[PDB]
Structures are given as C-alpha cells and as structure tokens.
Amino acid sequence: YKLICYYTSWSQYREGDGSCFPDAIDPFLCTHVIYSFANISNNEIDTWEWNDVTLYDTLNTLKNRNPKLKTLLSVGGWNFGPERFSKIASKTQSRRTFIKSVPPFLRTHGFDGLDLAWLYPGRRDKRHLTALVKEMKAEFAREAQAGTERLLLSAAVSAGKIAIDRGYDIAQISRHLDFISLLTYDFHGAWRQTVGHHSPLFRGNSDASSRFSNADYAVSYMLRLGAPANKLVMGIPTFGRSFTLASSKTDGGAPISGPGIPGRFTKEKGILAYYEICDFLHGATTHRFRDQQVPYATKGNQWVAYDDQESVKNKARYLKNRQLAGAMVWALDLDDFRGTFCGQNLTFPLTSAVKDVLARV
Ligand SMILES: *[C@H]1O[C@H](CO)[C@@H](O[C@H]2O[C@H](CO)[C@@H](O[C@H]3O[C@H](CO)[C@@H](O)[C@H](O)[C@@H]3O)[C@H](O)[C@H]2NC(C)=O)[C@H](O)[C@H]1NC(C)=O
C-alpha cells in the first residue's frame, strides 16, 4: 500500500510550534513525500521560496535513513493561476520547453518524480492536459535510457463529478500516470451560506441533491471512467474547515455568516490545523454524522468540520476494501507533527492512524 504525504513550503513561517521543516518528518511514516509547490518561470520549472534549495536538500536527506522513501516535487497549487497552466499547455512550444526543463531540475535536487497540481483545468483544457501528461511521461521514459531509475509522474485530480467531466480525460491520462491522488476533501462548496462537512465518506440517507459530493461516489465514478484501482489514491485531510454561525442553530443546514476565525498558528479564516482543532475541542460539543461517518464541533458561534483518528481509519478501511493503491494525506505540517497538542504523546496521530489500517493487511 502507498502512503503519499504532502509537505508545504510555507509552513516554515508559522510562529512557535506551528513552524515545520522537513526535519520533523518521520522517514518511515510515508512511502512518498511530496514537496509542495515548485513554480514556473520562462516556461521552466523553478523554485518558489528563497530557501527551497536548502529545504529540498533537507527533505531528500531523509532518504539516507530510509532508502526506500521516494520524494516528488509538485508544480502548481492554489496560489498558481490555472490560466498560467492553461497558457503553458496549449502552445506546444512552451509545453515542450517546460517538459525538457524538469528532469535536470529534479535530478539536481534529488527528487524521484514530479507531481502535477494543475488546480482545476477547464472545459477548453482537457485536450492539452492529456498532451502534457503524454509528453512528460515520454520524456521521462527517454531520460531513463541514460541508465538511471525512471522518474515518477503523478497528478492531483479533483473529486467533483462536474469538475471531472469538464477538464479530465481520466481514461487517457490514467495509463501514463504512476498514481492519481483524489482530492476527496473539497466537497462542501465555499460558494454558499450553509453549515456542512467538506470530506464526507458516504452520501448519507438525509439529503437528495448533491449525492456526488462524497468520497464514495468520487471513487466509484473514477473507477467507472476507467482509472485502475491500483493507480488511485484517496486523499485524506489532516485539517478542518471552520464556519461562523449566523444563528444559535448548530445542526445540519444551519445558517452561516462567514468563515470561522483564524487559528493561533495557521492564521487563515476558515481553516484549522488538526493540532489547532485538538485545542479547540476543549469546552466544545462534539457531534458525528452517522450516515457520512465524519465529525464536527461547535463552541460559541464557531462550527468546525474535521477528521479524527476514527473517521480517518474508517476512510482507510474503505480505501482497502475497494482495493485502491493507497492513501494521500494533505499536509503533514497540519497534523500534530510535534505530538504535543493532541493529548496522546503520539507524533503524527492522524497520519499514523491511516498507516495502521494500511499496515494490518
Ligand atoms: C514564479 O512564476 C512567475 C513567472 O516567472 C514569477 O512571477 C512575476 O514575474 C515578475 C517578477 O516580479 C513580475 O514583474 C515584472 O514584470 C511586470 C510585468 O509583468 C512589471 O510590472 C514589474 O514591475 C516587473 O518588471 C511579473 O509581473 C510576474 N509575472 C507573472 C506571470 O505573474 C513568480 O514570481 C514566481 N515565484 C513567486 C515567488 O511567486
């Protein structure tokens, strides 16, 4: 079983214990660690943070302790304009340029592969996305002729049915990618004013429309569209989503006035690190959707949708029963990496939970 874990560059600037460097990663925790977000300049892959070269090296030294540990660098991300991506892949001239620039880069800094994080291609992009993948794999296959281990090529893909139909040719790209990460944790849409869970496992016998907004459907749809189970990786969130209640109503469907207040270390409205959530829980009321098998908490006018050890284990069991390749965890820096916030002196409680399920078979 694979266990793909993302590490984000910007988590280093977090104050106090929130600060996280590659240093804190247990080399034996995951099978692959993806460094989050390289950038693109003059149609060529490039660094983002001033000290990326130092961090790249810090991350890749973990491989000295765990010889089997694979690392990848990811291009794109949320702060990377989809248009910029769209622009690079349409013109075969800039595409080939971008492509040829990658292997040397990755080889210089010690990466075993590239992760494509084109955050949401549109209807006019499908054709070009396919081209990018086809050609990149071809270039990688070629570079291996030089006597070295072929570079890996993966991609983070949307879990929403509409987004999927619109910009992805799943059948095509699947035969060229090494593994696909399903972003099964962006289900509750930031568009409108209601309380809801962003990473439900099941549909839940309790609301007819938007049966497409749960991991179960997402996985079944990908399999239907032709992606091999042995290449699909289900994404599991290590963070939670917060909301500011617009009323004293706390149950499903309650009115929302806006995102929840930021966390001490995370500092972003509407998001909270799992370790921030462990602190929040004190004096909070815990609930759990039985149909969807995920929890949520409320305190004052703040409403939080998150994942605990049990929900995460549940998702992992599901993942194993459908016979998927593994799990993907978004942000090791959002889990309790120090292991000092969430009671149990355990390090990486959430990621460890997934690993336990993947490991007992
Ligand atoms: C990776 O990706 C981008 C593309 O290379 C980097 O970017 C910007 O690139 C330069 C750097 O500041 C900007 O500014 C010059 O030109 C603009 C007009 O384009 C002038 O107005 C400005 O005064 C500068 O002379 C570009 O505007 C901007 N380009 C794009 C496409 O966004 C980007 O910096 C990088 N990594 C990071 C750290 O974000």
Give the Å distances, CA to CA, from 56 to 53, 98, 334.
5, 20, 19
Name every residue whose Cβ is closer than 8 Å to that of residue 3 and which is 6 or more positions away in sequence.
Answer: 29, 30, 31, 32, 326, 327, 328, 329, 351, 354, 355, 358
Q: Is the dihedral of CA 342, 347, 351, 352 positive or negative?
A: negative
Q: What distances in angstroms separate CA 221 from CA 75, 165, 212, 213, 321, one per listed residue?
A: 26, 10, 9, 11, 16
By DSSP bridging, strand 256-259 and strand 152-158 are unpaired
The torsion region of residue 287 among left (phi > 0), alpha (psi -120 to 50) and beta comes to beta
Question: Residue ranges of the domains in the chain?
Answer: 1-238+307-361, 239-306
Q: Cα(55)–Cα(39) distance, rounded to whole angstroms?
A: 15
- Please give the angle made by the CA atoms of 272, 183 and 85, to the nearest 5 degrees: 105
Tell the residue nearest (CA) to atom 7 of ligand 1.
41
**Beta carbons within 8 Å of 140's beta carbon, 6+ residues apart:** 103, 150, 151, 153
Give the C-alpha separation, 154 to 175, whole Å.
11
| Per-residue tokens: 75 | 């291009």
Collapse the DSSP code of 237 into the 3-class scheme (helix H, G, I; strand E, B; otherwise coil) and give the result: strand
Please list every protein residue whose CB sits less than 6 Å from any atom of ligand 1: 39-41, 48
Ligand 1 atom with minimal separation from the 41 CA:
5
Spatial contact of 293 and 309, defined as CB atoms under 8 Å apart: no
| In contact, 287 and 190? CB cutoff 8 Å | no
What CATH number should be reported for the domain whose range is 1-238+307-361? 3.20.20.80
**Rounded CA separation 113/107 (Å):** 9
Token pair 């990618």 is at which residue?
Answer: 177
- Distance of CA 148 from the midpoint of ligand 1 (Å): 35
- Could you tell me which of 207, 196, 193, 191 has the C-alpha nearest to residue 240? 196
Indicate the top mutation candidate among 13, 37, 40, 41 to test ligand 1's pocket, ranked by most ligand atoms within 8 A of CB: 41
The protein residue whose alpha carbon is closest to atom 36 in ligand 1 is 48
Neighbours of 135 (CB within 10 A): 18
Bridge partners, residue 256, by sequence: 245
DSSP category for residue 27: T
Tell me the C-alpha distance between 237 and 8, whole Å.
Answer: 14
Give the ligand 1 atom nearest the CA of 79.
39
- State both tokens at 140: 């990688």
Joined together, the tokens standing for residue 36 give: 């989050």
Estimate to the nearest angstrom the gap between the alpha carbon of 337 and the chain centroid.
17
What CA dihedral angle connects 305, 250, 255 and 290, to 10 degrees? 50
What does the alpha-carbon distance between residue 258 and residue 163 come to, in Å, rounded to a whole number?
24
d(CA 343, CA 16) in angstroms, rounded, equals: 18
The class that CATH gives domain 239-306 is alpha beta
Ligand 1 centre distance from Cα of residue 270 (Å): 29
Query: Which numbered atom of ligand 1 lies nearest the CA of 49?
Result: 38
Distances in Å between the alpha carbon of 316 and those of 3, 161, 213, 292?
11, 22, 18, 14
Q: How far is CA 265 from CA 130, 133, 273, 275, 351, in A?
A: 39, 37, 8, 10, 20
Ligand 1 atom closest to the Cα of residue 47 is: 36
What's the count of helices (H) and strands (E) in the chain, helices before strands?
Answer: 11, 15
Collapsing DSSP to helix, strand or coil, 257 comes out as: strand
Nearest CA to ligand 1 atom 9: 41
